Design a protein around this nucleic acid. Structure first.
Ligand SMILES: [Mg+2]
Ligand SMILES: [Mg+2]
Ligand SMILES: [Mg+2]
Ligand SMILES: [Mg+2]
Ligand SMILES: [Mg+2]
Ligand SMILES: [Mg+2]
Ligand SMILES: [Mg+2]
Ligand SMILES: [Mg+2]
Ligand SMILES: [Mg+2]
Ligand SMILES: [Mg+2]
Ligand SMILES: [Mg+2]
Ligand SMILES: [Mg+2]
Ligand SMILES: [Mg+2]
Ligand SMILES: [Mg+2]
Ligand SMILES: [Mg+2]
Lengths: 157, 98, 259, 207
RNA sequence: GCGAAUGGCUCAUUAAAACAGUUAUAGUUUAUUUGAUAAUUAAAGAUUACAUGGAUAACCGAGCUAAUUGUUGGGCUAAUACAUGCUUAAAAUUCCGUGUCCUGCGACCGGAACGUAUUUAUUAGAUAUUAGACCAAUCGCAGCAAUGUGAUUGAGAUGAAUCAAAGUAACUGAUCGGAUCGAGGUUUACCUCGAUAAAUCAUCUAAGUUUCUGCCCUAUCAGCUCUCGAUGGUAGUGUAUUGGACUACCAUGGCAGUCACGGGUAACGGAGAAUUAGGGUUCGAUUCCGGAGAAGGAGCCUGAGAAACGGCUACUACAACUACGGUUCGGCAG
């Protein structure tokens, strides 16, 4: 009644079981879409016993992950199940023979399963284009503490 | 007679359908008259003479349906020996019986 | 771009063809076939510049168009100026009963190996993919773009088969595993032949492999570039330029002019 | 040339974005194809109309413009018969699509219980017509009629909502097919989770 | 019937855009090629398959205009054009008949459906990483039952699938399942090697779109994008497919001194070019590659393929003919 309607006008799964399950009145009916992107990645416990209907998830959908895999710090928590990760790298300068600092910002999609927080390191995978920016989904989240400015924070992670 | 076709004082033919006593300009696609192909979609803004007959018409062709008692030389005097006899197996027999 | 390319430039045509730089401006562009553009040798190249049976361009035009049929590729007739003869193929010159192996040098140039009516029978096939299709049936596919029906089941995807062309029959295969012999179809290391050491898969999208050989050199290349020339040390075909092993520019000198 | 190139946009940082390429043909964008219903031929004679469009590869893609009959499946039972759709209600996407009884892939509609009624009857011995005459079996109970029982006893507890539906003649179901893409209109019969829910949208919608 | 969407010229546009080096396509289309695959022609209809049907160029003949690879109009016959179409496997599976026997929706009997593809719904595909045990019930292997037995044969592919292959239900029927063509043989019953049409899977070829990283001056450019998309979520459209690419509803984000946004560039980017102790400085219109364009700009036919442009439509500015009615296969950055 909550996870289902909640504003939006319906939220099923990829494997349209449900209502039909009432046919198997004895074993386990409460099926949800289960998956495992593999690639050396554990599938979130929370992902399984959730009521969430996120088609853009890498464990609850026919969303693949291929090639490019990222690790970066998180900037913002706003946006619906989407986050911006900031990567901090050095650039070399041919002439002066030294480096300068630089940061690329990245649009990342977050399946409800893992719980966000601002200023923590995150691991993204290469998933098909989900929107103008998005092209990365979160696969493994590590909580971390930064006392204040996320901008000030710059780590060659 | 049957009004077979039209030609203007400027070589402009008629187009059954375009019912307008005058010349209109259209884009022709294959399947049209007064329009030749050459690479599908040769669509062309060709101008043609209406379907309605007018004094502006120079030449009108006619098709003789039922001739009367009268006799015209150029018409009844003819006996054309159409040259091409049947060539498809079925068309052949259709003419000789079999 | 306008549509699909359709020509090829002297300058741009692969160094594997040992081509004439001054030559002209173009070069017979391989026809879409069994082997990829870069990995192939169009007949015109094969006879004119290679064998030298042909010469001028029209020379070919005769040979492949002449109602006699002078060229055979894997037991079949071919009449296309640029049929892409690829790796591990067998080409027969009718009018002389010549039989050749389409194999790369040790320096990476397409070489023509002369075979005896014996090897001319079998051809080595590498396994592309393996899956079951229509009405419960198993299918295997070879680099040579061969599609196989009901193949022996003990065959993993990255295998190498021996093919009896005469009977379009298979016999003695051999997967790639620690301890075999191999030929590398392309790479900074092509034309080499050694013993597989071990295959470290990295799944992230690209597995690698190591190798040893005669002078026990250490070789490194991606799996896709490994072709199993044989099982357990014994190679299956005669190799060009002696054994599939290249020399230091230093070893070449000492062998030739003995420095 | 209604294109869909992402060039006429503004990169992340909303700054306008350059162009050197005229609209290129592979960015094709075909004219939308609203899809209505003939469950009201009050004007509309030609029941269903589908026009085929020449697509890329060289294939054809049939486009549904006007319809009246689609195919639907009862999840639970695994039955599927072609039926006449009735009126469209609640389109979610927008209420205007309902106002024009347009057919979106996921538009919830009504159907004729006839085929399902006909079937539920033959396989269980239960017509579903007004409750009282409930069952209709055979005179003798020795032979194969012993199965309509076995099935009927399968506590065919078809939700109190599924039951009411039949008798009313109307049946709730959502669609699962792009009319503008394949020309057809196929849907599943509404049940449990969504049924209860979509109905609510309807109860509260009118009240 | 194919080709004409290769090439050839040019750089005006164009500073994360294009490009390059990289990566993805589990988000897609690809005529021609190479390998393979098809026992069932759907219903109603209709019915010849030793094989069907109708029409038209070329041609014959009449004609128009001052005019062009303009075209009217009458008569004649062929196709791989067009149009229409014949083709018995068994078993299995599913369902039906108040059919026998028996109770297992079990067995025998009889009837019906049954290729492929299309469109949905659903069942199962046993992440062969992952050992086993006891009582009950079902299940399947012997099975009249008794009592058992056994849990085994199994598992194509990937890092991973709502993959491959498959069962049931029905939908469309505009998917396919050859009414075609040679030559060489040979006392028969025919035989041998080919052409070509065309479906699906591969394959080759190429193309879309895509990950990451990198560009010259400049703040006498500091806040930018957001009335309609600016950032994300929802549902749909639409496409070859992904996507705010477009619609609707909802949230308010997205970028920035680690220089956003804006402006200049006699700026198309590379490969490279000139001088060079080392480090640098300055160029790259210009044979390779990729991009863009064809007078400016938009629109489109056709096709496997282009917004093509040595194809078409309209506008702006033009070029050629005119009997001033009208016409042009009018675009040399070949
Ligand atoms: Mg510090
Ligand atoms: Mg022609
Ligand atoms: Mg060719
Ligand atoms: Mg991969
Ligand atoms: Mg096709
Ligand atoms: Mg970029
Ligand atoms: Mg005629
Ligand atoms: Mg039977
Ligand atoms: Mg003969
Ligand atoms: Mg969507
Ligand atoms: Mg600028
Ligand atoms: Mg420059
Ligand atoms: Mg160029
Ligand atoms: Mg490119
Ligand atoms: Mg000139």
């Amino acid at each position: 009644m909550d996870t289902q309607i909640q504003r939006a006008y319906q939220k099923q799964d990829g494997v349209f079981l449900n209502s039909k399950k009432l046919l198997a009145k004895k074993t386990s009916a409460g099926v949800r879409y289960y998956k495992n992107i593999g690639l050396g990645f554990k599938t979130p416990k929370e992902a399984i016993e959730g009521t969430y209907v996120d088609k853009k998830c890498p464990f609850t959908s026919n969303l693949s992950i291929r090639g490019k895999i990222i690790k970066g710090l998180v900037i913002s928590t706003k946006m619906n199940r989407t986050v911006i990760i900031r990567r901090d790298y050095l650039h070399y300068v041919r002439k002066y023979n030294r480096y300068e600092k630089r940061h690329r910002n990245i649009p990342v999609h977050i399946s409800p399963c893992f719980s966000v927080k601002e200023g923590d390191i995150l691991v993204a995978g290469q998933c098909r284009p989900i929107s103008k920016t998005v092209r990365f989904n979160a696969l493994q989240v590590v909580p971390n503490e930064i006392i204040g400015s996320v901008r000030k924070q710059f780590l060659l992670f | 007679f049957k009004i077979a076709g039209g030609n203007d004082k400027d070589g402009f033919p008629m187009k059954q359908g375009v019912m307008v006593r005058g010349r209109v300009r259209l884009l022709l696609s294959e399947g049209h008259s007064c329009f030749t192909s050459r690479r599908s979609g040769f669509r062309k803004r060709k101008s043609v003479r209406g379907c309605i007959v007018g004094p502006d018409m120079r030449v009108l062709a006619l098709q003789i349906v039922k001739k009367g008692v009268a006799e015209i030389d150029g018409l009844t005097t003819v006996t054309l020996p159409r040259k091409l006899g049947p060539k498809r197996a079925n068309n052949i027999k259709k003419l000789f019986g079999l | 771009a306008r549509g699909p390319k359709k020509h090829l430039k002297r300058i741009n045509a692969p160094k594997s063809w040992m081509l004439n730089k001054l030559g002209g401006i173009w070069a017979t562009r391989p026809s879409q076939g069994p082997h990829k553009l870069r990995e192939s040798l169009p007949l015109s190249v094969l006879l004119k510049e290679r064998l030298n049976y042909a010469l001028n361009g029209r020379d070919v035009t005769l040979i492949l168009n002449d109602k006699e049929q002078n060229v055979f590729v894997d037991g079949k007739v071919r009449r296309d100026k640029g049929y892409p003869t690829g790796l591990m193929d067998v080409v027969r010159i009718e009018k002389t009963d010549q039989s050749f192996r389409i194999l790369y040098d040790t320096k990476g140039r397409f070489v023509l190996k002369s075979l005896s009516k014996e090897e001319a029978k079998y051809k080595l096939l590498k396994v592309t993919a393996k899956a079951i299709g229509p009405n419960q049936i198993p299918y295997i596919v070879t680099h040579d773009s061969r599609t196989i029906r009901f193949p022996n089941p003990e065959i993993k995807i990255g295998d190498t088969l021996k093919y009896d062309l005469v009977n379009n029959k298979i016999e003695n295969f051999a997967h790639l595993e620690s301890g075999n012999v191999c030929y590398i179809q392309q790479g900074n290391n092509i034309g080499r032949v050694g013993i597989i050491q071990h295959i470290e898969k990295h799944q992230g999208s690209f597995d690698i492999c190591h190798v040893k050989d005669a002078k026990g050199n250490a070789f490194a290349t991606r799996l896709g570039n490994i072709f199993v020339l044989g099982q357990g040390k014994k190679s299956w075909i005669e190799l060009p330029s002696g054994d599939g092993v290249r020399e230091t520019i230093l070893e070449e000198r000492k062998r030739k002019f003995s420095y | 040339g209604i294109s869909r190139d992402s060039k006429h946009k503004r990169r992340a940082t909303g700054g306008r974005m350059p162009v050197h390429r005229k609209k290129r043909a592979f960015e094709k964008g075909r004219p939308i194809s609203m899809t209505k219903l003939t469950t009201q031929s009050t004007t509309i004679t030609e029941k269903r109309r589908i026009r085929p469009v020449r697509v890329r590869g060289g294939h054809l893609k049939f486009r549904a413009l006007r319809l009246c009959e689609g195919n639907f499946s009862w999840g639970s039972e695994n039955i599927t018969r072609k039926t006449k759709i009735l009126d469209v209600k609640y389109n979610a996407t927008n209420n205007e699509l309902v106002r024009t009884k347009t057919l979106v892939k996921n538009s919830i509609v009504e159907i004729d219980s006839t085929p399902f009624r006909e079937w539920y009857k033959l396989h269980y011995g239960i017509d579903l017509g007004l409750k009282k005459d409930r069952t209709v079996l055979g005179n003798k109970e020795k032979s194969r009629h012993v199965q309509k029982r076995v099935k009927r006893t399968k506590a065919q507890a078809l939700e109190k909502n599924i039951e009411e539906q039949f008798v009313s003649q109307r049946i709730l179901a959502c669609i699962t097919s792009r009319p503008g893409q394949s020309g057809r209109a196929d849907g599943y019969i509404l049940e449990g989770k969504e049924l209860e829910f979509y109905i609510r949208k309807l109860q509260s919608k009118k009240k």
